[PDB]
Write a protein that binds this DNA or RNA. Structure first.
Lengths: 126, 164, 142, 56
RNA sequence: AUUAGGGUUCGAUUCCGGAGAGGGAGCCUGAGAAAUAGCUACCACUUCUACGGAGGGCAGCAGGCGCGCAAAUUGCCCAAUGUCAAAACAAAACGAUGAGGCAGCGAAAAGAAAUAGAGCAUUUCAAUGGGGGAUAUUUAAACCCAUCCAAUAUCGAGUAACAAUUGGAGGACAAGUCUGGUGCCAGCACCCGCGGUAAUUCCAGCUCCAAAAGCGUAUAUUAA
C-alpha cells in the first residue's frame, strides 16, 4: 500500500467535430497499482472534470485495450453538446451501455419466418 | 476465405539430419545459451542466412549503385543497432561474416545473465517468463527478445514484480 | 555432340521432346498406362474387403511365411494381395472385414522378400492396425 | 501353414516395464544432456567418446 | 513449391477475366438476360391429390443421403465492410442483407513458448501460470487476449500425481561386441541384409540416441 490506486488521464489526438456536435480524442489511462482494470465509470468522471464538462453522460467512451504487463490502457471518447447529441448521434449499442436502450426486437429469425408466410398472402389477411 | 493475413516460416531443418560434427556444435550452443530446442538454433541460421545473402547480392553489385547505397546502408545500420556488429566496423563486407553466436549473444536471455541479474542462463530464461524482467518500463516475457544496443542500459526489473 | 546456333531453337526444343520419352521415372508420369494399372488408381490409400488369409513363402535365401491377405477394393473392385505388417496381427483380421490398404513405400513395386506384394494394411475396421498390435485400442466387436 | 502366427511375441516372458522417477523436460533436459557430455567429463587423449557402454 | 545459376513443377481455391445453374433448347420484360430462388417445352429423376389435378431444381449458407483415402454448426448478428433503395439520425417511428462479420468444429500450414529456478545423499528460501475468480475490460451480445490477487477489504503447485511423446540403437545414420526369450520359427528389413542354439538387426527389460508439442507411415511433387 504505497497509497490508494491512482488513475490519471491524457487525451491524445483531439478533434472538434462540428458536424456531429462532438469532440473526438484518444484517451490514455496512466493508472499504476490499480488492481484489475479501470472500469469506464471512473474514466468518464475524470474526463468530465478535466475538460469541465457539465454532465457525466455527455462523455461517451468506447473500446479499450490495456497494455501488456502494466497498468496503462488506451481508448476513445466523445464529448457532446448537452442531452441531445448523445441521443441522436450515438449507436444503439453504445447507448444501452449508458442505460439508454432501444430494446432488441424479436430474434432476427422470427422476423424472417413471418416475412415469408406473408409472401403468400394478398389483401388484408397479410 | 477472403482473409488476407500473411504468414511465413522463420526456420529450416538441415539436410543430413545427424552429423556428429554439427550435433556436437548444436549441443555446445544449447547448453551455453540455455536454449530449449534445436529449433531456436535453426532460426538464427535463417535470419542470418537471409541477412547474409542480401549482403552478397548488394556486394556483387557496383559501388554507388542506388541499391547498394540505400538498401546497403540499411542492413549495415540495423546490425549496429542490435549490436550484431561493432560501430567500428562499416565495410558491408563484415555483414558477410557473422556467426550464430553474434545473434545469440544479443538475445535477452543471455544478456540478463550477462548483465548479471541471474546465475547463468537458466535462471535468466525462467526469470523472464516469470515476468520479472522489464526492458525499459516494459515487461518482456519472451526469451528471444533481441535487445537493441540502445536498450541494454534500461533492463533492471519490473515494477509489478516482487522487486519493485 | 549437339547443334548450336542463334536461330536453332526449334531443333533443340524438338530434340528434347523426343528424348525425354526415353526416360522412365516419367515415361511413368506420362502414361495413363501407369494409372489404369495402379489398383489404387492414383490415390495414396484404399479400402478393401478381406477375401482370404494367405501365407506367402518368402523369397530367395530367406525362409519365412509372410502373413498376407487378399483384398477386394471398394473403388475399383480389383483384387490385391496385401501384407499384414507385424507380429500375430493376422489375428486382428477376420474375413469380410473392411481394411484400409497402403503402399509398401517403393511406389509400385514389392518390398524385398515378399514376392510381388506391393501393399500393406494400415487399419482394420476403422481402427488402426499398429494401434491394435501395440496395445492401445480394442478392436470393435460388431 | 498360418497357425505359427504370433509364436514368439507371446512366448517371450513379460517384465511389465519398471517404475522410475520422471526426467526434466524442455530446456531442463537440454541442460541435463549438456552437463553429462561437455562438463564433468574430461578425456584422456585418447580421442574417443562412448555414450553407451555395457558391463561386458 | 522448390531452386547457386539455368531450370522442373503446381495454379478447382480469396483478386481480375471467362462459363454454367440437372440435361438441352426457346423467349418475355428491360438500359442491360438468351436470366433459371423469371417464364414455355421436351428428356431423366421426383412431391403432394378427395383421381379431377397441382408442383420441384442447394455448383447461395447451414444440414441430410451417396460417394470416396479425403473436408466443420440445420449456430448468433447486421456492430463493422459494401450493395440495392422511395432511404440520415433521432423523436410514438432502429429497411432487407446466410453478401459480410462473430463465435462453434478445426495438430492442413505459420509465430511465440511452459513442463522448473536458487544455495547423489538431503534439507529448505523464493517465483510462476495451468487452473479458480473479479469492481471489471472485451464484444452488437457472448467469447478469446490483455489487466488483476488489494486499493480499506479476495485463490492456490512439490514425488511440480499439474507425471512428454513418437520413432530408433549392424551399415548408409547419432546411439549397446548389456540381460532375458525364440531357433531360417515368429517376425524385422525403404536398400544391403538379420533369424537354422552363445542373434550388435526379431520379441522383451534396462540403457543411450534424434527430433520434440510434436513424431512416424502412404502417395504425389521439387532438390538430390
Amino acid at each position: 500500500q504505497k497509497k490508494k490506486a491512482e488513475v490519471s488521464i491524457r487525451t491524445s489526438q483531439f478533434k472538434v467535430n462540428k458536424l456531429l456536435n462532438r469532440k473526438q480524442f484518444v484517451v490514455e489511462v496512466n493508472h499504476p497499482h490499480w488492481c484489475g482494470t479501470v472500469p469506464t465509470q471512473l474514466i468518464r468522471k475524470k474526463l468530465a472534470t478535466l475538460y469541465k464538462v457539465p454532465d457525466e453522460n455527455q462523455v461517451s467512451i468506447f473500446g479499450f485495450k490495456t497494455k501488456f504487463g502494466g497498468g496503462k490502457t488506451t481508448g476513445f471518447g466523445l464529448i457532446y453538446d448537452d442531452f441531445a447529441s448523445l441521443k441522436r448521434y450515438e449507436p444503439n449499442y453504445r447507448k444501452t451501455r449508458m442505460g439508454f436502450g432501444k430494446p432488441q426486437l424479436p430474434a432476427r429469425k422470427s422476423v424472417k419466418e413471418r416475412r415469408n408466410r406473408n409472401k403468400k398472402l394478398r389483401g388484408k389477411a397479410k | 476465405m477472403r482473409n488476407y493475413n500473411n504468414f511465413n516460416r522463420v526456420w529450416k531443418a538441415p539436410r543430413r539430419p545427424f552429423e556428429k560434427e554439427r550435433l556436437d556444435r548444436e549441443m555446445k550452443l544449447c547448453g551455453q545459451y540455455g536454449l530449449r530446442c534445436k529449433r531456436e538454433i535453426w532460426r538464427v541460421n535463417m535470419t542470418l542466412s537471409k541477412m547474409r545473402r542480401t549482403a552478397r547480392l548488394l556486394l556483387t553489385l557496383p559501388e554507388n549503385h542506388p541499391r547498394r547505397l540505400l538498401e546497403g546502408s540499411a542492413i549495415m545500420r540495423r546490425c549496429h543497432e542490435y549490436g550484431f556488429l561493432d560501430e567500428e566496423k562499416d565495410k558491408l563486407d563484415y555483414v558477410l561474416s557473422l556467426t550464430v553466436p553474434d545473434i545469440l549473444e544479443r538475445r535477452l536471455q543471455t544478456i540478463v545473465f550477462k548483465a548479471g541479474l541471474a546465475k547463468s542462463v537458466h535462471h535468466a530464461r525462467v526469470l523472464i517468463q516469470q515476468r520479472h524482467i522489464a526492458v525499459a518500463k516494459q515487461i518482456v516475457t519472451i526469451p528471444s527478445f533481441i535487445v537493441r544496443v540502445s536498450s541494454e542500459r534500461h533492463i533492471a526489473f519490473a515494477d509489478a514484480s516482487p522487486f519493485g | 555432340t549437339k547443334t548450336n546456333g542463334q536461330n536453332a531453337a526449334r531443333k533443340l526444343v524438338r530434340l528434347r521432346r523426343r528424348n525425354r520419352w526415353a526416360d522412365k521415372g516419367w515415361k511413368r508420369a506420362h502414361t495413363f498406362a501407369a494409372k489404369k494399372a495402379n489398383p489404387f488408381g492414383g490415390s495414396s490409400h484404399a479400402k478393401g474387403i478381406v477375401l482370404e488369409k494367405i501365407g506367402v513363402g518368402a523369397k530367395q535365401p530367406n525362409s519365412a511365411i509372410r502373413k498376407c491377405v487378399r483384398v477386394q477394393l471398394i473403388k475399383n473392385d480389383k483384387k490385391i494381395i496385401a501384407f499384414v505388417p507385424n507380429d500375430g496381427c493376422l489375428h486382428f483380421i477376420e474375413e469380410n472385414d473392411e481394411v484400409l490398404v497402403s503402399g509398401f513405400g517403393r511406389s509400385g513395386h514389392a518390398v524385398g522378400d515378399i514376392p510381388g506384394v506391393r501393399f500393406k494394411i494400415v487399419k482394420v475396421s476403422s481402427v488402426g492396425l499398429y494401434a491394435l498390435y501395440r496395445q492401445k485400442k480394442e478392436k470393435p466387436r460388431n | 501353414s498360418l497357425a505359427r502366427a504370433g509364436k514368439v511375441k507371446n512366448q517371450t516372458p513379460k517384465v511389465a516395464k519398471q517404475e522410475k522417477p520422471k526426467q526434466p523436460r524442455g530446456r531442463a533436459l537440454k541442460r541435463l544432456k549438456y552437463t553429462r557430455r561437455f562438463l564433468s567429463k574430461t578425456v584422456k587423449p585418447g580421442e574417443k567418446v562412448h555414450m553407451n557402454k555395457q558391463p561386458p
